[PDB]
């Protein structure tokens, strides 16, 4: 009979501490690797904040919730941005990060979290603001729904998570936060803060 | 001495609780005899909850019991530092002593460095006793604090103490032979058990900024566990941001159970639950004080 710690507690700590070998083992003993602690912090949060890039990838390739928000609404992208870590920021965006996800107390996106006085600020903020600018224009305007959405108005498209759509018209028709998109044979407004440049990886 | 009455009046703040001087005296006197009838090195079995510093934060002690289950629903081991700094050291220690007398085989208190007449003379408890009662009561607490056990081993796998390791700790039998009642000496085994700290930047035994005892590094932890076939050291004594903090690849854990310690930190408090298979998990006392779509324009 030996001492062992709760596997979820092991996933959080090993992801924070950089013990990639343990992360690979203990993750198959946790029920939901996306489950947070008592403050909304997940294993992916810890890996991103501590800069353990290989763990960030592994968790994201594993299918964890790339957009899990804490009590303040901080997503992993918010964390990467506050570290001015453009490389992780790009990998998260390519993995389904909600670009326009906003925090609760201040209504700020990840781009707004880049740290003015720390190194890497220019490249990281210009990447994220640049993605906010060209989202729905670059890549032939192709965009992906990161959540389900039943419409609340008649001119709103129903979205299933993973839906691939084209932004026909954005930010220029009396709607700064809703974009006119095409989904298959239908057109309608979609809410920008549930959209990604790329879709999530499926768990 | 009616313990149910006493505990009831202490639990009624669920604000000062007015126990009589003789009631408080009786708590010290009955608990002292129980402390002396049990070993100074406790040998316990899981399941149990383990808690760190309280420092007179009485309302947080009630939160601990609400979360973990009031005695005797759960077994408890407290690692010391019940008094000083906080505003309600008297309510804190009185309820812990009352539970110890009610459930002496399921409720356990270890001595911390503040269960010491030299330390709590100056860090609050002496003043609290003098203000709300008298000096003689403070001396009765000292006689009782001087009989507290100082360490515990859970299922021969978890070594528990308030502070940490000691250069003078070669065998558990040296703990067992410390006689009571005793003060906390200026140096030596009992002192280190109540006063030492781990330190990630120390190889071996370093200096301790408290001016007492030593710091110990990760290698000291590993050697101690290997020699005594232990898996874990569980200690308290230092405020940690998340209520619990690992050291030396999770071979040691620091537990602290007073959230917003001193009102100066924003720390959480934690207790550790050990189940029958020695699976350990942490309950956090938070400091007591699809996404939404945009609107249409
Ligand atoms: Mn303390
Ligand atoms: Mn202490």
Residue numbers in the entry:
A (entry chain D): 920 to 1122
B (entry chain A): 7 to 20, 26 to 300, 317 to 324
Show sentences the authors wrote.
We solved the crystal structure of human PP1α7-330 bound to ASPP2920-1120 (hereafter referred to as PP1α:ASPP2 complex) at a resolution of 2.15 Å. ASPP2 binds to PP1α through three surfaces of interaction, covering ∼1200 Å2 of solvent-accessible area: the RVxF motif, the first ankyrin motif and the SH3 domain, respectively, burying 530, 120 and 500 Å2 of solvent-accessible area. ASPP2 residues 921RVKF924, constitute the canonical RVxF motif, which binds PP1 hydrophobic pocket in an extended conformation similar to what has been observed previously for other PP1-binding proteins. The second patch of interactions is formed by four acidic residues from the ASPP2 first ankyrin motif facing PP1αK260 and PP1αR261. PP1αR261 forms a network of hydrogen bonds with ASPP2D932 and ASPP2E938. PP1α317–323 adopts the characteristic right handed type II polyproline helix containing three residues per turn. The two conserved prolines PP1αP318 and PP1αP321 sit in two xP binding grooves formed by ASPP2L1113/W1066 and ASPP2P1110/W1097, respectively. PP1αR323 is tightly coordinated by three acidic residues from the ASPP2 SH3 domain: ASPP2D1074 and ASPP2E1075 from the RT loop and ASPP2E1094 from the n-Src loop.
In mammals, four PP1 catalytic subunits encoded by three genes exist: the broadly expressed PP1α, PP1β and PP1γ1, and the testis-specific PP1γ2. As well as their PP1-binding RVxF/RARL motifs, ASPP proteins have C-terminal ankyrin repeats (like MYPT1) followed by an SH3 domain.
